[PDB]
Amino acid sequence: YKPVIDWVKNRINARMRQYRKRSLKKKNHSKVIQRFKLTRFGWQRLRSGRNGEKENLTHKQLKRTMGYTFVSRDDLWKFRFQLPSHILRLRDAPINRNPNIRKIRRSLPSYFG
Amino acid sequence: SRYVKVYRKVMNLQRRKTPLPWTPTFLEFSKEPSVPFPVREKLQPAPIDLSYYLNMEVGDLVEVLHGPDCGRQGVVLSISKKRNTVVVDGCNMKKSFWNPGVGASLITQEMPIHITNVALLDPVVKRPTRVKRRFMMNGECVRISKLSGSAMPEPVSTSALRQPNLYQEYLRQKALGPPLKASYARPDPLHLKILQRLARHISWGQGSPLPTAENPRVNSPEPMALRR
Amino acid sequence: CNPQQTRRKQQYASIIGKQGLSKKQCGIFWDYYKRKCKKRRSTKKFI
Amino acid sequence: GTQRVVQKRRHQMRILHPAQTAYVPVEQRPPPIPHSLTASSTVKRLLNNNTVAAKEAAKRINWGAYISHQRGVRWHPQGAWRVQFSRRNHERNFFVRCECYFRVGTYGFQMAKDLAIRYRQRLEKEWEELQEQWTKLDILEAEQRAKYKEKREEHLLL
Amino acid sequence: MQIPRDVIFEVVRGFRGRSRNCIKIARVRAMKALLYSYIMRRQRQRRYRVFWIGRINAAGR
RNA sequence: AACAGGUGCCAGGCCAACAAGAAUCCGAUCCGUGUAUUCCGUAC
RNA sequence: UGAUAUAAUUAUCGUACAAGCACUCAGCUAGUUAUUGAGAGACACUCACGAGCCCAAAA
RNA sequence: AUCAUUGUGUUAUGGUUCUAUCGCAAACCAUUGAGA
RNA sequence: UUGCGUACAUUCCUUAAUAUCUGGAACGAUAGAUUAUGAUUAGGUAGUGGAAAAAAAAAAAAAAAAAAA
RNA sequence: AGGGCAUGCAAUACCAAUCAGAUAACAACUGAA
RNA sequence: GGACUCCUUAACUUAAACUGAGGAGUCAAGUAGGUACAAACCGUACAAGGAUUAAUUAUGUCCAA
RNA sequence: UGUAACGGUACAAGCUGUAAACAAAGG
RNA sequence: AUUAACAUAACAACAU
RNA sequence: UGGGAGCGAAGAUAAUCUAAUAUGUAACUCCGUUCAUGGAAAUCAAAAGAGCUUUCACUGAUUGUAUUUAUGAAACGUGAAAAAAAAAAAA
RNA sequence: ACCGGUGGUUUGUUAGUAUUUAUGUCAUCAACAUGUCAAUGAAAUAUCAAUAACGAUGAAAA
RNA sequence: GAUGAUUGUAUAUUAGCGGCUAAAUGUCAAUCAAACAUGCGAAUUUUAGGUUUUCCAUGAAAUCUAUUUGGAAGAAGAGGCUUGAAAAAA
RNA sequence: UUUUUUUUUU
RNA sequence: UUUUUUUUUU
Secondary structure, rough: OOOOOOOOHHHHHHHHHHHHHHOOOEEEEEEEEHEEEEEEOOOEEOOOOOOHHHOOOOOOHHHHHOEEEEHHHHHHHEEEEEHOOOEEEEEOOOOOOOOOHOOHHOOOOOOOO | OOOHHHHHHHHHHHHHHOOOOOOOOOOOOHHHHOOOOOOOOOOOOOOOOOOOOOOOOOEEEEEOOOOOOOOOOOEEEEEOOOEEEEEEEOOOOEEEEOOOOOOOOEEEEEEEEEEHHEEEEOOOOOEEOEEEEEEEEOEEEEEEEEOOEEEEEOOOHHHHHOOOOOOHHHHHHHHOOOOOOOOHHHHOOOHHHHHHHHHHHHHOOOOOOEEEOOOOOOOOOOOOOOOO | OOOHHHHHHHHHHHHHHHOOOOOOHHHHHHHHHHHHHHHHHHHOOOO | OEEEEEEOOOOOOEEEEOOOOOOOOOOOOOOOOOOOHHOOHHHHHHHOOOHHHHHHHHHHHOOOOOOOOOEEEEEOOEEEEEEEEEEEEOOOOOOEEEEEEEEEEOOHHHHHHHHHHHHHHHHHHHHHHHHHHHHHHHEEEEEEEHHHHHHHHHHOOO | OOOOOOHHHOOOOOOHHHHHOOOOHHHHHHHHHHHHHHHHHHHHHHHHHHHHHHHHHHHOO
């Protein structure tokens, strides 16, 4: 008595596995994207209390509540996985420590180098 | 289910006769290597020629056991040993095609049948039986049936069973291509001969000018000089 | 993943760098040594 | 497929852009300020501080004294003149790397400069000469080789 | 891992039974053997300075 | 890939009914298809 | 003979130490994978073309 | 370089895993035989 | 009153620095031979980063190299 | 393939509603494959 | 959602190595030295590496030293 | 078709089927 | 025929 | 055989629980695979037009069902492979 | 271009391999026991001679 | 106990979503408040074990909101890191 | 077939 | 304009 392996079966299943594996696609949330807006400037959303009681509120507060506000940077991480399709590339200010470009350089006779 | 597609795809490979022909082009590579080969088992019983053992000869009378032709008698036309198959007249007709010749627009042809699906009829009894060979003192071979114990009749002559194969003719015609144009089909030997004559002057002329009415002459061919 | 592989490698290395070794001499490494020699002989082949 | 939107900034109804300058052709470009000067703290703070006192001090500071019109001679934040002369030779197996320093506290600001200049000038010539000798050496070697080959052939003829 | 295997055997040369041959035991043994020398080579100085001071005082007296 | 088999171990020119060197030098015992050089057959 | 020295490993605030495994050796044994992803102020390599880049399956 | 002697060093013997094929198409290519 | 013992020198000799700022934006260059009074340095759990190795297999680049033979 | 080739694998299925056995007089008698 | 000590302080039997707060050091993640014997105290120009060298520190100077 | 039992062979993981390792010469 | 653990033997030592 | 027909639960996810996914998945019975399955319009489209059936790519993880967890080779349309209305009143 | 006969390639030098049976349980059921068809040697058609020793063949032995 | 709810025997019936039970959770192939065998139905774990070569650079926390807030830091967010410097003669 | 396509311009 | 398919004669 010896153990005989099912090469036919094993190879058949492995080919299927590989084929399936290398055929995948992205997935995005529905509810999430149903409550967000993408713009050139950044993500957009609504303010809470819109549908709530607004009796004890001034005009200034009402106006702001009726408005929109950008999504905080702390929450962007979620989107990475939630909304792979939709990607927002942040663009911060330049960071250059070159003394040559500084205003001080103008008073100097020449440039450092 | 979300696995049918892949399943089928995988299965197809089995039937696939990999590798397949592939013509080359400019800056192009083949993909045949990337095609997995089919899976097969080696250890299996060796083949056998059932035709030889059953004492079944071309032109013999047989009857269909199963299939659409539950009871139908015929004459064996062809036997294939490697496939273990036989061809019986007036039975199992499924292969249809366009008429390659004179007649109707459609013609059918008989298809091969497994040897196992047929049996030899008894001479007198007219029932499926077995046949055994017996050798005489003189070396004469006689085929004797089991049921009746009687001698079998001789086979039909091949000249009578010879028939044309129109399926092959249709395949040969298809291999060439679509039908030719009427205009193009028309012969023109008068101008074809002039073109053929000009072809030799162009090829074996060595750049020599063609003959003219005022100068009907042409430079002779030059031989291959040896390296002294 | 063991002392055994070090012994096999040391043994191998001690015989690889030689010529005119017999089958009885090479031992388990006979195939390897033959492939090495045939590989080496490739440079001497001209059109 | 997928969309990749870039972020933008708004200011006074205008799209903010990074600083950019045009090209100003110049007939002759003056020498730059050595970078080594920045390695100290007095200038480092000056540069790192954007203030009127700094800008005024900058004006007063004489930048022209540290400029050296001689290759191989540079200023060091240690308060010295560094002399650099690096060369390699694998053929002759000779590698040289000068790291001479001329301190100010020993000689002076101008004296050191002068001395360094002189030293580099000297080294140049020295190198030149050495190369010129190596060529003749090579030639000689060649000649000896040829004579040895002829002598070897003599024995075969004998 | 701390020490090569090839060197442990060398270092454990001359020790008692099972400790000159056992990788397991040898490890722990060798570690301490090297540690002690490591530690003592730094303190070797004051132990000789005190001896020199004592001999000088003896002589002087 | 001359892995086509064998001949004492790695053979295009040796056995294998059809082409082609008992080729020369080197070799611890020790045959040795092995190193160096060279010739030839091939629509194999 | 003189001087000197508290097996190793993990957890833990704690060398925690009288807690857990191991007599020794030989063989096997625990971070595998982008035809589908990527630079997001706790760290993100490199090649080609350029307002233009890639080209899917047949072949 | 502490064997005082029951230790250590070298070497040798013993123990010690175990691989010599009895095989290689149903696919493709080339060639040949009778009859259309 | 005047004393003395004591832990730690990068004085000497040999190495190392990868999140944009150590001179170095220097020199050299046919693919870098390691700076002699050179400044800061180099204890480390968790986490993070750089670099050198692991005797094997494949590739149709294992003889234009002194002397000797 | 000249010749020969005990025995066992429960076999009217080269045909024919179903339900035990050498495959069942009606009815009793029922059913997702 | 921390172990010892310094100052202030809540609770407790002005008790306990408890329970919980405000702000400094050490350990955690620190070596060797001193405190007789086992992290927390003093000192350190505090452990890349090697050798037979010089120094005001906690602190010592009858013997073990 | 594929296999199990008994017998023979040299009692055997082979071969074989009481004709149980062969008829080769039909005038 | 064959590594280690393991088993036995021979030689080597004197400031004791 | 992850093919087709009958019947068909649970471990698991939702950090317990209902729906839901797993999955019409596993076990049981039957058909036995290109000589198969399928099929030559009372269809789709909307104001143009395509013209039996079948395979691949893109449209597109778009629309839709769900939500506390997922699932989804959707329809029209484009490219490409293979191309098939009927032999026929009898002798 | 079917059909018969001959040869070669790929699958496959890169991948692999199973048929006999001792032992457990009432049964279902589970299971890789024990180097090779094998003294050794390329060759046994080289294993000679015999009483101790020296002798024979073999690259190597009693 | 032994003239009686005596003992003993061939071949038989009740099958786990169960049967047996003069009623103990006693028994059904010598640890049954729910038996044993098989499973491409390819088993789940806020607990807990293990996690394999060197050298170098840099270098933590035991704090906060929320989770009907826990305890042996579970999950999510915030906070905490490479900023600077430190080389000189009338 | 997918992606991108200045907000400046005497 | 900067290209290209070989049998005549089973």
